[PDB]
Amino acid sequence: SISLLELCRNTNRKQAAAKFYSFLVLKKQQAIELTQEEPYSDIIATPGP
Amino acid sequence: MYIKQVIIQGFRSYRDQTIVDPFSSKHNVIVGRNGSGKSNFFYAIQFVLSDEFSHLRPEQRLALLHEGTGPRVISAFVEIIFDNSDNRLPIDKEEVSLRRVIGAKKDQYFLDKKMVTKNDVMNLLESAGFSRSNPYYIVKQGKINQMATAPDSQRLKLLREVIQLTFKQVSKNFSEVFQKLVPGGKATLVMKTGVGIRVSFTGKQGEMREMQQLSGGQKSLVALALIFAIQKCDPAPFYLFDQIDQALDAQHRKAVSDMIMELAVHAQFITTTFRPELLESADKFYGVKFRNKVSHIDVITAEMAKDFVEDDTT
Amino acid sequence: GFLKLIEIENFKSYKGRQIIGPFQRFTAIIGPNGSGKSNLMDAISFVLGEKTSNLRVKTLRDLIHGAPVGKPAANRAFVSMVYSEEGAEDRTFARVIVGGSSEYKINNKVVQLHEYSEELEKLGILIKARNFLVFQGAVESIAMKNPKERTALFEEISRSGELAQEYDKRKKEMVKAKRAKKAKQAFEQIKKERFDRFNACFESVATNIDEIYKALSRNSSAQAFLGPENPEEPYLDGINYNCVAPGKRFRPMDNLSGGEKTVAALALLFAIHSYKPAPFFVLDQIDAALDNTNIGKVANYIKEQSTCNFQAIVISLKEEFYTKAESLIGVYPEQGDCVISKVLTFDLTKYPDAN
Numbered sequence A: 001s002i003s004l005l006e007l008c009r010n011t012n013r014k015q016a017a018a019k020f021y022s023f024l025v026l027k028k029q030q031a032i033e034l035t036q037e038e039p040y041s042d043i044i045a046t047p048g049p
Numbered sequence B: 001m002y003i004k005q006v007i008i009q010g011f012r013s014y015r016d017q018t019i020v021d022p023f024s025s026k027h028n029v030i031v032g033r034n035g036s037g038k039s040n041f042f043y044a045i046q047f048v049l050s051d052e053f054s055h056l057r058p059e060q061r062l063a064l065l066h067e068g069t070g071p072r073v074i075s076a077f078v079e080i081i082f083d084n085s086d087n088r089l090p091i092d093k094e095e096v097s098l099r100r101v102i103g104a105k106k107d108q109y110f111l112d113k114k115m116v117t118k119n120d121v122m123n124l125l126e127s128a129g130f131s132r133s134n135p136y137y138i139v140k141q142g143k144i145n146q147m148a149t150a151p152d153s154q155r156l157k158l159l160r161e162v163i164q165l166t167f168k169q170v171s172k173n174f175s176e177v178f179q180k181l182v183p184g185g186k187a188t189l190v191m192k193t194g195v196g197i198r199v200s201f202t203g204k205q206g207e208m209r210e211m212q213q214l215s216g217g218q219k220s221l222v223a224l225a226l227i228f229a230i231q232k233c234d235p236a237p238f239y240l241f242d243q244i245d246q247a248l249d250a251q252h253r254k255a256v257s258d259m260i261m262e263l264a265v266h267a268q269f270i271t272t273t274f275r276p277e278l279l280e281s282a283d284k285f286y287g288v289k290f291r292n293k294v295s296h297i298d299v300i301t302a303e304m305a306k307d308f309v310e311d312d313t314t
Numbered sequence C: 001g002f003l004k005l006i007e008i009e010n011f012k013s014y015k016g017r018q019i020i021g022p023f024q025r026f027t028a029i030i031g032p033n034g035s036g037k038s039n040l041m042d043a044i045s046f047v048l049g050e051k052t053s054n055l056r057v058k059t060l061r062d063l064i065h066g067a068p069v070g071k072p073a074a075n076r077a078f079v080s081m082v083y084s085e086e087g088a089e090d091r092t093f094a095r096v097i098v099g100g101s102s103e104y105k106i107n108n109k110v111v112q113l114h115e116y117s118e119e120l121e122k123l124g125i126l127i128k129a130r131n132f133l134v135f136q137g138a139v140e141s142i143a144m145k146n147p148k149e150r151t152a153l154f155e156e157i158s159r160s161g162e163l164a165q166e167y168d169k170r171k172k173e174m175v176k177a178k179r180a181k182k183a184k185q186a187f188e189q190i191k192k193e194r195f196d197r198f199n200a201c202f203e204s205v206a207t208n209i210d211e212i213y214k215a216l217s218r219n220s221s222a223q224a225f226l227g228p229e230n231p232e233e234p235y236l237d238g239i240n241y242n243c244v245a246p247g248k249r250f251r252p253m254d255n256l257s258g259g260e261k262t263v264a265a266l267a268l269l270f271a272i273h274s275y276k277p278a279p280f281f282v283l284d285q286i287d288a289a290l291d292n293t294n295i296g297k298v299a300n301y302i303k304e305q306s307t308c309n310f311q312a313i314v315i316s317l318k319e320e321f322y323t324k325a326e327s328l329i330g331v332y333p334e335q336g337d338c339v340i341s342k343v344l345t346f347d348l349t350k351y352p353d354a355n
């Protein structure tokens, strides 16, 4: 329900990569689940069980 | 049992006097740069308490002395003095002086400031919990991933040394520590001749498998989980963790740092990491520099290490 | 040449019709542990036809998604890659596993392993060179190969192994030396052909690696010397490899610091690229014993040599190293009947440079 790029507008490469890595690693504990359809596109953040 | 003091003089990176402020009670992280002398410090620590350095031909031993400034150093000095406060060592001395002196041909020991031969140390170290037979609890650089996939024969020998009854509760300790490390994991030891390790994570239903097929990061978790299980069942002197978490993610790094903090109270865990995640769980840090072909050791405050490893220092 | 996309179905820890995202000149892959991060590297190495025993698998029967849990998902599984160069020749390679064996496909056509390897070697990528695929533990191992087989590495990369099997017996049919003289001048032809082929690889890589490692370390003091033993017949015994660190003099390689040693490997890994340049390099956590003060130099070298000479995809965990990469595709797991793994792809070159 929460997108990514619109909160990543005014950021540099380092912090953007760090927060993308955090977004990708937080799913390992099924906290937030993500679904992608187009290879280079935004994904909304829908929390998991 | 208690690494109190270490003295190095021309072993492999510190040509001159390198007297160090005595170690912490619980945990010690040694941050530094590349080509500085962190591993050589750990190799010095285990040079007096691990057999497999002096068993080779006098070629690696000859090159094991500092020759970077020209002539080889006459005396390669490494000393660590222990603390038998809990009377774990057979010698009832509050401050036991233990050291190995090596030169061009010398390979001898000094115990409480007297000369002695190598033959006198194995009994006292084994009675103190030191496992000189195997490189247990002294995990080297990048080797944390081979203990997990080791064949069942090696694990059976390890548990036999650690005999026929101190394994059922070791399995329970491994279960509890592994669920502590991984909230969703359900690994368990199984006794067949050999012992298997039914590893699992995030499935919790039927994902029990065999150790070899696990990922390259889960292997480090399994290996250190077995080490910590052996610790919880039976205390061990201390632990040298040289880049114990260079392969696993920061998520487990926090999950191993907090629980090593919960485990540092009983025994000392001297470690080394370039990631800030593991250094939050110590009291007295360290910093190893490399200048003018003579390295140096100096204690650094917490914020100094945090600044050193938080971002690039180029 | 650079990969565009890879389709994986029912391979190791992979389920679904998902397709790997596009690859760029320098694209990094990151993610958590147990997420099948090397599984992408596993597929990239699998479509090259390995010996199927260094992927933490046995007898090629458990490569199926969730096979070693007692309930394999299915039996049909495949991994396919595409490849292209300047000219949009979108060639396609693929491998399928069925029953207890496998079949090979090129542009969706059953192709024997002989023709498969023949088509592969036509791009400069070899089948058993082992010279661009590095695993988790290989990074510190590719720096310290046993020279007795580093010689074999240099021999096979030099396109010279196909005569080695007919080389040695020649010697044993000289010792028997009318006919003896004409046997004598019927012996040195293969000798000198293999000799100058091995050298054409050897002095080329040796004279380029010093500049490569100097560029890697941006220091004049650091250098790398690659010399054989018995230079008259350099391809028999081990190829001695030595390097002089910025702060250290000439010392044995096997006792080098873990920080520089990997760099040495990278230098060597980026030196054998001089002779028969491989289309792409994949790096599986070369960031093992590398500090934030040294991954920067390697990353800068990769950036400057990734848009001019070749392409590189890296597995890494340190935030600094994969920050520099143009793209940062990732891999993440997911709960299910088995340990599901699937790939998430983003981009960074659109975002502004780090401040």
Ligand SMILES: Nc1ncnc2c1ncn2[C@@H]1O[C@H](COP(=O)(O)OP(=O)(O)OP(=O)(O)O)[C@@H](O)[C@H]1O
Pocket: B213, B214, B215, B216, B217, B218, B247, B248, B249, C011, C012, C013, C014, C032, C033, C034, C035, C036, C037, C038, C039, C040, C057, C062, C063, C064, C065, C066, C067, C068, C339, C341
């Ligand atoms: N034969 C198999 N079939 C299906 N799934 C498997 C198989 N072997 C392992 N897995 C699953 O996939 C994972 C393998 O991951 P892999 O070996 O690619 O590591 P990785 O993601 O690169 O990890 P890291 O870099 O953190 O060490 C295991 O953790 C397990 O969950």
Ligand SMILES: Nc1ncnc2c1ncn2[C@@H]1O[C@H](COP(=O)(O)OP(=O)(O)OP(=O)(O)O)[C@@H](O)[C@H]1O
Pocket: B011, B012, B013, B032, B033, B034, B035, B036, B037, B038, B039, B040, B041, B063, B064, B065, B066, B067, B068, B141, C245, C247, C248, C255, C256, C257, C258, C259, C260, C289, C290
């Ligand atoms: N036998 C030796 N004598 C003298 N110096 C040596 C010897 N072996 C290695 N060195 C040097 O000691 C320095 C410290 O290396 P060290 O063993 O501490 O590295 P490491 O801990 O494995 O790696 P890193 O610190 O980069 O993570 C390096 O410059 C290395 O070249």
Ligand SMILES: [Mg+2]
Pocket: B215, B216, B217, C037, C038, C136
């Ligand atoms: Mg991995």
Ligand SMILES: [Mg+2]
Pocket: B038, B039, B141, C257, C258, C259, C289
């Ligand atoms: Mg090191």
